[PDB]
Amino acid sequence: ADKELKFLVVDDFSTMRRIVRNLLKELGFNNVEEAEDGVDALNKLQAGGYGFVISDWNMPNMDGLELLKTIRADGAMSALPVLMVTAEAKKENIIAAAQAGASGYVVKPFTAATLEEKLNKIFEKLGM
Numbered sequence: 001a002d003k004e005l006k007f008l009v010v011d012d013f014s015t016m017r018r019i020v021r022n023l024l025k026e027l028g029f030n031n032v033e034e035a036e037d038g039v040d041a042l043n044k045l046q047a048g049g050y051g052f053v054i055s056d057w058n059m060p061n062m063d064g065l066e067l068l069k070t071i072r073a074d075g076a077m078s079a080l081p082v083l084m085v086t087a088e089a090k091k092e093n094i095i096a097a098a099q100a101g102a103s104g105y106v107v108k109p110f111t112a113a114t115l116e117e118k119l120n121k122i123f124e125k126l127g128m
């Protein structure tokens with residue numbers, strides 16, 4: 001994928017956003033922004049330029065399922081890649097996010113190798 005692709009990393013805890021940001025840099029992506037919840041996330045997406053979202057699930061104000069649903073229902077954002085990265089691992093939640101349109105789903109804790117695998121799997125399916 002184009003190394004200039006802009007990412008938005010959403011999680012309500014700094015530690016996790018920091019881990020994803022660093023991993024993304026390893027992969028060659030330095031155009032990355034952070035958000036602390038769904039609303040904050042939507043405000044930045046509004047601002048424009050984003051080509052990929054990586055989101056947590058449990059966050060105050062607007063959780064990740066809602067954020068995902070919001071993005072898919074928005075005419076100007078509906079196809080935006082959204083990779084869930086969460087501790088939620090019950091099948092019913094994986095199903096709910098999958099059905100809601102999630103591009104991929106990663107359960108915490110995750111290895112560096114797993115994140116790169118899932119990001120590439122999504123680039124592959126979208127021809128990015």
Ligand code: BEF
Pocket residue numbers: 056057058059085086087088108
């Ligand atoms: F808070 Be996330 F769903 F890990």
Ligand SMILES: [Mn+2]
Pocket residue numbers: 011012013056057058059
């Ligand atoms: Mn959380």
